[PDB]
C-alpha cells in the first residue's frame, strides 16, 4: 500500500455543517479517485472552549498549549475523544465511508507522557506503533483519530492536535497536511505567506507575527517536514472550490519546507 | 477462536477507583488464564446524570430509556463515547491490556435506527457485522465499546447499554454477562432472586417489583438468552472476592434462563 496521507482537521470550521458537508463530499471524491490511504486526525479546541463556557470555566494556554488541570481532563476528553470524534464518524457514515474512531492510545499508535507539571494533563506526543492503523488501512477503513492519549501509568492526556498529527505521521511514514480556518500563515499585514522555512518561522515568531495556535502549528509542521523529508502544508478548508486542488497537492496556503 | 464473552459494565461502580482497580485486576487474571476472547460493552448513565447537573439540565426516562433531545445528544455522546470509554481504556492501559475503544458504528458492529420520535435521539439496536471486532479479537485486542451509535443518515444515537450489549452478543455469537451495582434482580423484600424466566419477569414487572433500569436490563437479558440459547446473568461487580467465580460462570446474581 502507498504511504498514507494524514489530513489534520481543525479550526472553527469544525462547527459548520455546510463546511463539513462540503469537506466530506471532497473526501469521498478523493478516496474514490486515489489509491493513497487516508487517515484523519482532528482537533476541536472550539468544542472545548464552548463546553467550558456552559460550565463557566476559564481557558489558559501557555504558549499554544491548553493548561489541563486534573479536574478538567475528563470534560476535555469527552469533548475531543467523544463529541468531536463521533461527530466526524457520523459525517463519514452519512457519506458511506467505512471509518473507525480511535484515540492516541489505541494500538499504542502514539506514545504520550506528561509534558510539564505546569500544564497539568497535557501530553508530549512521540512515534508509537503503526501496526493497528496499518491493518485498518489495509482492510479498507478510514481511521479518524482524536488527540487524547494515555500514559503507560493510565493517566489520560490532552495532546495538541497538531503535535499528535506530526507524531502519527512519523509513526506511519505518512505525508501530512494541516487544515485550519485561515489560508495558511499570514504576515504582519494579514496576507498569506506562500513558503516557510525554519529560519523564517523563527523571525516571524520573534516579531510577534505568528502567535498562539499558529506557533504550535508551524513548529509541528517543521518537525514533520524535517522528519519525513517532505513538504508539509498549512491551508484552509473553508472554500469548496479549493478543496480538490488542495488534496491534489497544490499550494493553497503555506508550504513548510524541510 | 472460541465464542467471545461480552462483559457489560454499568452501575455507580463506574465512578469508583477502588472498584475499577479491583475489576481490572480480575480481568487480567481471567485473560491470562482463559483462551476465551473478551469484549467489554459499557454504560455510564451516572457520568451523564452528573454532567447534566453541572449543566443544570433535567433527566427524563420513559420506561428505562433516557429522553435524548437533539440539543443534548452531543453532550451525552461526549460523556459516554468519550469520557466513559476513554476512562476504561486508561485502566486497561494501566494494567498492560492492549485495548481498542469503539462505538456501535465502528465496522457497523451494531445497526442503529431512531426508536421513537418521543424519545429523541435514542436508538434501537440490532445485529450488525462482526467482521471488525472478530479481526480485533483474532489480533489480540480487547475491544471496549460504548453505547452511542449512528444511523445510516449520519445521526448520532444514544442506545441504552444493556440493549447495545445484547445486540452485539447476537452479532458476535457471544455469551453475555450484565454487571451492575446490585446483586442481581431483587424481590419485594429486596432479596436476590436466583433464577429468572420470561413468565416470572412479567409478573414482577406488573407488580412493580422490577422498575426503571432493571426493566430494560431484564428484557435485554431475556432477549439475549432466547437468541443465543444460553443463560445470561445479571450480577454485581462490587465485591472483589466474588469476581473470580463470577467470570468462571458461577451463579452470583440472577441467572436468566432462555
Ligand atoms: N501569523 C498567523 N497566521 C495565521 N493564523 C495565525 C497567526 N498567528 C496566529 N494565528 C491564529 O492561529 C489560529 C489557528 O490555530 P488554532 O486556533 O489553534 O486552530 P487550529 O489549530 O484548530 O487550526 C488562526 O485562527 C489565527 O487566529
Ligand atoms: N427489582 C429490582 N432489582 C434490582 N435492581 C432494581 C430493581 N428495580 C429497580 N432496580 C434498579 O435498577 C438499577 C440498575 O439499573 P441502572 O441504574 O440502569 O444501572 P445500570 O444499567 O448501569 O446497571 C439498580 O441500581 C436499582 O436501583
Ligand atoms: C494541549 C492542548 O492544547 N490541546 C488541544 C487539543 C485540541 C486541538 O489541538 O484543537 C486543546 O485545545 O485542548
Ligand atoms: C437511551 C439510553 O437510555 N441510554 C443510556 C446509555 C448509558 C447506559 O445504559 O448506562 C443512558 O443513560 O443515557
Ligand atoms: Mg490549534
Ligand atoms: Mg441502565
XYZ file of C-alpha atoms and ligand atoms in Angstrom:
598
model
C 0.000 0.000 0.000
C 1.155 3.574 -0.614
C 2.372 5.922 2.118
C -0.739 7.308 3.789
C -1.799 10.939 3.773
C -2.848 12.309 7.156
C -5.379 15.115 6.938
C -5.430 17.063 10.204
C -8.728 18.899 10.728
C -9.022 21.909 12.986
C -10.376 25.445 13.178
C -13.832 26.875 13.823
C -14.955 25.184 10.613
C -15.434 22.085 12.764
C -18.621 23.839 13.966
C -20.006 24.363 10.448
C -22.460 21.899 8.921
C -22.058 23.449 5.474
C -18.270 23.285 5.758
C -18.411 19.651 6.912
C -20.779 18.614 4.137
C -18.542 20.261 1.528
C -15.424 18.658 3.051
C -16.775 15.117 3.233
C -18.045 15.493 -0.321
C -14.490 16.216 -1.436
C -13.088 13.429 0.740
C -15.321 10.873 -0.970
C -14.354 12.190 -4.395
C -10.679 11.952 -3.433
C -10.978 8.452 -1.942
C -12.802 7.084 -4.959
C -10.137 8.568 -7.241
C -6.858 7.939 -5.393
C -5.264 4.747 -4.105
C -3.396 6.573 -1.350
C -4.917 5.620 2.020
C -6.258 8.489 4.125
C -6.100 8.970 7.889
C -7.824 11.826 9.674
C -6.505 13.403 12.864
C -8.755 16.027 14.407
C -8.648 18.789 16.972
C -11.646 20.685 18.308
C -10.351 23.397 20.607
C -13.557 25.265 19.778
C -15.851 22.488 21.035
C -13.863 22.666 24.268
C -13.952 26.457 24.603
C -17.748 26.269 24.307
C -18.189 23.492 26.858
C -16.020 25.459 29.298
C -18.420 28.386 28.907
C -21.566 26.390 29.539
C -19.602 25.149 32.522
C -18.296 28.626 33.350
C -14.628 27.611 33.454
C -11.505 29.563 32.388
C -9.203 28.837 29.449
C -5.463 29.390 29.792
C -2.965 28.494 27.083
C 0.716 28.628 27.939
C 2.179 29.322 24.513
C -0.345 27.460 22.381
C -0.960 24.590 24.816
C -4.144 24.482 26.924
C -3.476 24.132 30.648
C -5.407 20.986 31.558
C -5.959 20.515 35.324
C -6.776 17.048 36.638
C -10.325 18.243 37.326
C -10.848 19.108 33.648
C -9.228 16.220 31.761
C -12.442 14.167 31.835
C -14.518 17.030 30.413
C -11.925 17.738 27.734
C -11.636 14.031 26.867
C -15.402 13.995 26.485
C -15.404 16.954 24.113
C -12.450 15.802 21.984
C -12.333 11.989 22.119
C -16.113 11.788 22.306
C -18.140 14.598 20.749
C -15.666 15.784 18.105
C -14.563 12.274 17.164
C -18.058 10.793 16.906
C -19.380 13.833 15.025
C -16.789 13.200 12.293
C -17.644 9.484 12.310
C -21.313 10.431 11.736
C -20.420 12.569 8.725
C -18.305 9.736 7.327
C -21.259 7.348 7.775
C -23.592 9.847 6.107
C -21.221 9.690 3.137
C -20.929 5.892 3.012
C -17.350 5.983 4.294
C -16.371 2.986 6.421
C -14.494 4.752 9.229
C -13.166 3.702 12.633
C -12.721 6.135 15.501
C -9.548 5.928 17.580
C -7.576 7.928 20.140
C -3.782 8.005 20.509
C -3.627 5.069 22.907
C -5.388 2.594 20.594
C -2.757 0.128 19.408
C -0.192 2.394 21.103
C -0.327 4.415 17.876
C 1.224 7.486 19.507
C 3.304 7.402 22.701
C 2.324 10.030 25.257
C 3.910 11.233 28.520
C 3.269 14.249 30.741
C 4.943 17.238 29.115
C 5.134 19.630 32.068
C 3.643 19.667 35.552
C 2.844 23.360 34.950
C 0.448 22.308 32.179
C -1.326 19.556 34.064
C -2.613 16.653 31.956
C -1.042 17.863 28.712
C 0.848 15.220 26.798
C 4.084 15.113 24.845
C 3.461 13.003 21.736
C 6.078 10.797 20.106
C 6.021 7.986 17.483
C 4.386 4.728 18.527
C 3.407 1.529 16.701
C 1.864 1.673 13.193
C 0.582 -1.919 13.351
C -3.064 -1.289 14.268
C -3.632 1.601 11.870
C -1.704 -0.117 9.055
C -4.015 -3.119 9.443
C -7.114 -0.906 9.441
C -5.878 0.819 6.294
C -5.105 -2.486 4.574
C -8.637 -3.636 5.401
C -10.214 -0.565 3.809
C -11.130 1.590 6.822
C -10.634 5.337 7.256
C -9.152 5.869 10.749
C -10.405 9.063 12.445
C -8.131 9.832 15.402
C -8.629 12.292 18.288
C -5.726 13.939 20.159
C -6.406 12.486 23.588
C -3.794 9.966 24.703
C -2.828 7.992 27.791
C 0.432 7.345 29.647
C 1.703 3.859 30.469
C 0.556 4.502 34.047
C -3.008 5.022 32.862
C -3.361 8.812 33.016
C -5.371 10.491 30.247
C -3.515 13.265 28.437
C -4.642 16.155 26.254
C -2.288 16.443 23.275
C -2.454 19.476 20.992
C -3.827 18.013 17.727
C -1.062 19.460 15.535
C 1.609 17.686 17.581
C -0.446 14.474 17.611
C -0.704 14.612 13.810
C 3.055 15.031 13.396
C 3.787 12.171 15.771
C 1.382 9.911 13.883
C 2.909 10.991 10.571
C 6.346 9.801 11.709
C 4.795 6.589 13.072
C 3.101 5.783 9.752
C 5.702 7.298 7.447
C 2.850 9.385 6.062
C 2.520 12.730 4.334
C 0.788 15.476 6.271
C -1.477 18.445 5.582
C -2.731 20.738 8.352
C -6.160 22.259 7.639
C -7.338 25.245 9.668
C -9.674 28.261 9.451
C -7.086 30.542 7.832
C -5.425 30.463 4.412
C -2.082 29.416 5.864
C 0.321 31.556 7.878
C -0.327 35.277 7.481
C 2.224 38.079 7.711
C 2.126 41.414 9.516
C -0.412 42.814 7.054
C -2.518 39.671 7.295
C -1.540 38.370 3.866
C -0.821 34.718 3.129
C 2.844 33.653 3.211
C 3.392 31.154 0.369
C 6.517 29.356 1.590
C 8.041 28.824 5.026
C 11.426 27.686 6.371
C 12.694 27.219 9.933
C 14.681 30.465 9.727
C 11.695 32.500 8.514
C 9.456 30.921 11.155
C 11.848 31.957 13.922
C 11.865 35.552 12.663
C 8.066 35.827 12.485
C 7.695 34.302 15.960
C 10.219 36.701 17.482
C 8.498 39.624 15.735
C 5.168 38.514 17.172
C 3.624 37.847 13.768
C 2.960 34.161 14.477
C 1.128 33.737 17.796
C -0.929 31.327 19.922
C -2.160 28.333 17.947
C -0.102 29.162 14.877
C 3.129 28.921 16.860
C 2.311 25.329 17.810
C 1.151 24.631 14.254
C 4.216 25.917 12.389
C 6.534 24.094 14.817
C 4.690 20.792 14.340
C 4.772 21.353 10.584
C 8.544 21.976 10.556
C 9.177 18.884 12.692
C 7.127 16.718 10.333
C 8.839 18.245 7.292
C 12.362 17.566 8.529
C 11.411 14.148 9.940
C 9.635 12.933 6.802
C 11.888 14.835 4.417
C 8.816 16.074 2.572
C 6.993 19.426 2.436
C 4.078 19.978 4.818
C 1.243 22.382 4.063
C -0.930 24.567 6.258
C -4.155 25.562 4.500
C -7.850 26.334 4.929
C -10.816 24.079 4.189
C -13.280 26.967 4.162
C -13.773 27.333 0.393
C -15.300 24.432 -1.522
C -13.741 25.208 -4.912
C -10.238 24.934 -3.454
C -10.696 21.534 -1.804
C -9.986 19.481 -4.970
C -6.620 21.063 -5.825
C -5.777 21.078 -2.114
C -5.907 17.285 -1.833
C -4.184 17.052 -5.219
C -1.110 18.623 -3.645
C -1.488 22.185 -4.925
C -0.091 25.142 -2.900
C -3.200 26.680 -1.327
C -1.762 28.019 1.915
C 1.718 27.935 3.394
C 4.127 25.222 2.309
C 6.602 24.257 5.016
C 9.943 23.237 3.530
C 12.139 20.713 5.366
C -11.203 -18.845 18.240
C -13.811 -19.557 20.918
C -17.142 -17.743 21.188
C -16.414 -14.438 22.901
C -17.728 -13.392 26.290
C -19.160 -9.877 26.431
C -18.876 -8.259 29.840
C -21.298 -5.336 30.087
C -20.222 -2.798 32.718
C -22.662 -0.423 34.344
C -23.799 0.947 37.691
C -22.428 3.623 40.008
C -19.343 1.449 40.430
C -18.119 3.081 37.221
C -17.353 6.095 39.458
C -15.220 4.098 41.914
C -11.440 3.953 41.559
C -11.192 1.121 44.080
C -13.904 -0.833 42.269
C -12.204 -0.269 38.900
C -8.787 -1.298 40.186
C -10.241 -4.487 41.682
C -12.167 -5.233 38.465
C -9.261 -4.754 36.074
C -7.109 -6.866 38.377
C -9.587 -9.711 37.961
C -9.887 -9.094 34.219
C -6.137 -9.524 33.775
C -6.164 -12.691 35.867
C -9.034 -14.039 33.760
C -7.437 -13.096 30.426
C -4.118 -14.672 31.318
C -5.917 -17.860 32.371
C -8.647 -18.313 29.743
C -8.487 -18.577 25.962
C -11.991 -17.181 25.531
C -11.754 -13.696 23.987
C -13.309 -10.865 25.994
C -15.246 -7.842 24.758
C -16.389 -5.052 27.044
C -19.540 -3.020 26.457
C -20.077 -0.156 28.873
C -22.787 2.208 30.005
C -22.292 5.241 32.224
C -25.708 6.704 32.937
C -24.157 8.096 36.118
C -21.461 10.080 34.288
C -24.306 11.589 32.273
C -26.545 12.385 35.246
C -23.621 14.290 36.781
C -22.773 16.265 33.651
C -26.441 17.251 33.341
C -26.249 18.669 36.866
C -23.135 20.730 36.281
C -25.050 21.874 33.227
C -28.304 22.233 35.167
C -30.372 20.096 32.789
C -33.264 17.691 33.529
C -33.273 13.902 33.210
C -36.385 12.112 31.976
C -36.531 8.376 31.343
C -39.574 6.984 29.581
C -39.597 3.456 30.962
C -35.863 2.936 31.376
C -34.791 4.904 28.291
C -33.337 8.419 28.640
C -35.146 11.016 26.536
C -32.352 12.464 24.402
C -33.243 15.776 22.685
C -31.224 16.876 19.663
C -29.670 19.611 21.810
C -28.278 17.033 24.253
C -27.002 14.216 22.026
C -23.577 15.856 21.653
C -23.153 16.246 25.422
C -24.294 12.680 26.038
C -22.025 11.349 23.272
C -19.174 13.185 24.953
C -19.885 11.631 28.337
C -20.447 8.073 27.069
C -18.408 7.640 23.872
C -15.687 9.926 25.188
C -15.211 10.171 28.949
C -16.556 6.761 29.989
C -14.946 4.929 27.077
C -11.512 6.531 27.422
C -11.535 6.140 31.213
C -11.888 2.364 30.766
C -9.166 2.403 28.097
C -6.865 4.151 30.615
C -7.480 1.465 33.230
C -6.787 -1.231 30.640
C -3.511 0.522 29.735
C -2.594 0.813 33.415
C -2.965 -2.970 33.543
C -0.951 -3.712 30.393
C -4.072 -4.705 28.461
C -3.932 -3.913 24.743
C -7.430 -2.486 24.237
C -9.175 -0.615 21.427
C -12.063 1.762 22.028
C -15.053 1.611 19.690
C -18.650 2.810 19.438
C -21.540 0.952 17.785
C -20.960 2.443 14.344
C -17.344 1.264 14.021
C -17.315 -1.509 11.428
C -21.129 -1.316 11.507
C -20.857 -3.605 14.541
C -24.385 -2.785 15.716
C -27.130 -1.392 13.467
C -28.988 1.570 14.942
C -32.145 3.462 13.911
C -34.327 6.005 15.701
C -36.553 4.103 18.110
C -39.272 6.688 18.748
C -39.670 10.371 17.947
C -40.964 10.800 21.521
C -37.520 9.789 22.805
C -35.465 11.988 20.521
C -32.026 10.650 19.570
C -32.495 7.272 21.250
C -31.539 4.310 19.122
C -32.971 0.864 18.512
C -30.043 -1.565 18.347
C -29.969 -4.658 16.155
C -27.242 -7.104 14.986
C -24.651 -5.730 12.583
C -21.376 -7.051 11.148
C -18.918 -8.998 13.356
C -16.021 -8.586 10.905
C -14.170 -5.681 12.538
C -14.430 -6.942 16.111
C -13.657 -10.540 15.091
C -10.462 -9.280 13.446
C -9.524 -7.236 16.519
C -10.091 -10.279 18.714
C -8.043 -12.529 16.429
C -5.220 -9.984 16.608
C -5.199 -9.992 20.409
C -7.021 -6.755 21.285
C -9.691 -6.218 23.940
C -12.486 -4.165 22.313
C -14.120 -1.674 24.717
C -17.392 -0.478 23.177
C -19.632 2.454 24.181
C -23.404 2.520 23.545
C -23.504 5.508 21.224
C -24.379 4.607 17.641
C -25.210 6.313 14.361
C -27.920 5.876 11.722
C -27.170 5.383 8.030
C -28.196 9.021 7.539
C -25.475 10.160 9.921
C -27.452 10.959 13.078
C -25.844 10.070 16.417
C -28.000 7.888 18.653
C -27.951 7.122 22.367
C -28.560 3.396 22.867
C -29.233 2.018 26.343
C -26.078 -0.030 27.077
C -27.964 -3.207 28.021
C -29.690 -3.294 24.632
C -26.409 -2.497 22.860
C -24.739 -5.416 24.655
C -27.477 -7.847 23.619
C -27.341 -6.695 20.012
C -23.565 -7.135 19.953
C -23.901 -10.559 21.573
C -26.131 -11.748 18.720
C -23.757 -10.157 16.188
C -20.726 -11.983 17.609
C -22.488 -15.150 18.723
C -21.085 -14.384 22.165
C -22.049 -15.180 25.731
C -23.186 -12.277 27.870
C -22.990 -11.172 31.497
C -24.550 -7.922 32.725
C -22.691 -6.351 35.667
C -24.396 -3.661 37.734
C -24.371 -2.126 41.233
C -26.843 -4.633 42.689
C -26.569 -8.367 43.359
C -28.943 -9.228 40.530
C -32.701 -8.700 40.441
C -34.202 -8.188 43.891
C -37.709 -9.109 45.018
C -40.287 -7.172 47.015
C -38.271 -7.545 50.218
C -35.080 -6.539 48.435
C -33.619 -10.042 48.400
C -31.740 -11.506 45.447
C -33.767 -13.665 43.038
C -31.558 -16.596 41.964
C -33.252 -17.615 38.712
C -35.446 -15.764 36.227
C -37.754 -16.748 33.351
C -39.854 -14.641 30.972
C -43.034 -15.538 32.873
C -41.577 -14.563 36.256
C -40.173 -11.338 34.803
C -43.603 -10.330 33.510
C -45.150 -10.913 36.941
C -42.537 -8.853 38.803
C -42.834 -6.013 36.278
C -46.623 -5.919 36.553
C -46.351 -5.990 40.358
C -43.945 -3.060 40.233
C -41.065 -5.023 41.740
C -38.781 -4.528 38.729
C -38.606 -0.842 37.764
C -36.645 1.757 35.774
C -33.246 0.484 34.671
C -33.917 -3.078 35.769
C -36.890 -3.346 33.421
C -34.649 -2.555 30.449
C -31.961 -4.865 31.836
C -34.104 -7.969 32.389
C -35.708 -7.550 28.949
C -32.316 -7.296 27.227
C -31.148 -10.320 29.207
C -34.170 -12.419 28.170
C -33.734 -11.434 24.514
C -30.069 -12.447 24.580
C -30.905 -15.701 26.375
C -33.527 -16.795 23.860
C -31.481 -15.534 20.894
C -28.233 -17.216 21.941
C -29.937 -20.201 23.545
C -27.703 -19.789 26.581
C -28.267 -18.439 30.108
C -27.494 -14.773 30.768
C -26.544 -13.466 34.200
C -27.153 -10.172 35.958
C -24.708 -9.632 38.823
C -22.702 -7.077 40.793
C -19.003 -6.265 40.493
C -18.893 -4.519 43.863
C -17.199 -7.249 45.926
C -13.669 -8.293 44.996
C -13.822 -11.837 46.390
C -16.754 -12.689 44.119
C -15.166 -11.513 40.865
C -13.193 -14.742 40.220
C -16.134 -17.162 40.472
C -18.271 -14.630 38.597
C -16.127 -14.802 35.457
C -15.822 -18.562 35.963
C -19.550 -18.845 35.318
C -20.789 -19.223 38.894
C -24.304 -18.009 39.877
C -23.624 -14.765 41.754
C -26.745 -12.789 40.903
C -29.778 -13.588 38.788
C -29.490 -16.182 36.044
C -31.812 -15.520 33.118
C -32.989 -18.761 31.531
C -33.863 -18.841 27.817
N 0.648 34.635 11.747
C -0.522 33.958 11.890
N -1.040 33.498 10.682
C -2.240 32.786 10.686
N -3.020 32.457 11.720
C -2.443 32.949 12.904
C -1.252 33.667 13.028
N -0.972 33.995 14.304
C -1.967 33.486 14.921
N -2.923 32.825 14.171
C -4.093 32.185 14.773
O -3.977 30.768 14.685
C -5.336 30.245 14.514
C -5.324 28.777 14.144
O -4.844 27.986 15.251
P -5.876 27.229 16.186
O -6.852 28.231 16.665
O -5.128 26.561 17.225
O -6.805 26.351 15.317
P -6.468 25.053 14.906
O -5.237 24.545 15.471
O -7.740 24.104 15.284
O -6.328 25.039 13.328
C -5.881 31.190 13.414
O -7.334 31.068 13.551
C -5.348 32.551 13.963
O -6.345 33.118 14.857
N -36.286 -5.364 41.199
C -35.127 -4.664 41.072
N -33.999 -5.405 41.413
C -32.742 -4.805 41.329
N -32.426 -3.562 40.955
C -33.604 -2.870 40.624
C -34.912 -3.360 40.665
N -35.824 -2.444 40.286
C -35.080 -1.438 40.027
N -33.715 -1.583 40.197
C -32.767 -0.506 39.909
O -32.003 -0.821 38.748
C -30.670 -0.249 38.954
C -29.687 -0.739 37.913
O -30.032 -0.214 36.613
P -29.253 1.040 36.037
O -29.329 2.111 37.054
O -29.830 1.373 34.756
O -27.733 0.756 36.068
P -27.062 0.068 35.047
O -27.878 -0.240 33.893
O -25.772 0.983 34.644
O -26.503 -1.294 35.632
C -30.369 -0.711 40.403
O -29.324 0.215 40.845
C -31.751 -0.401 41.059
O -31.736 0.965 41.559
C -2.984 20.546 24.925
C -3.751 21.100 24.006
O -3.537 22.288 23.641
N -4.635 20.623 23.463
C -5.693 20.965 22.391
C -6.317 19.761 21.681
C -7.393 20.159 20.560
C -6.645 20.879 19.440
O -5.465 20.855 19.068
O -7.527 21.599 18.899
C -6.674 21.641 23.011
O -7.257 22.717 22.638
O -7.321 21.371 24.209
C -31.089 5.645 25.798
C -30.482 5.405 26.945
O -31.162 5.136 27.972
N -29.358 5.411 27.148
C -28.361 5.188 28.306
C -26.938 4.819 27.881
C -25.939 4.573 29.112
C -26.420 3.327 29.853
O -27.091 2.348 29.501
O -25.983 3.482 31.024
C -28.306 6.336 29.001
O -28.353 6.500 30.269
O -28.186 7.644 28.551
Mg -4.674 24.564 17.431
Mg -29.097 1.031 32.863
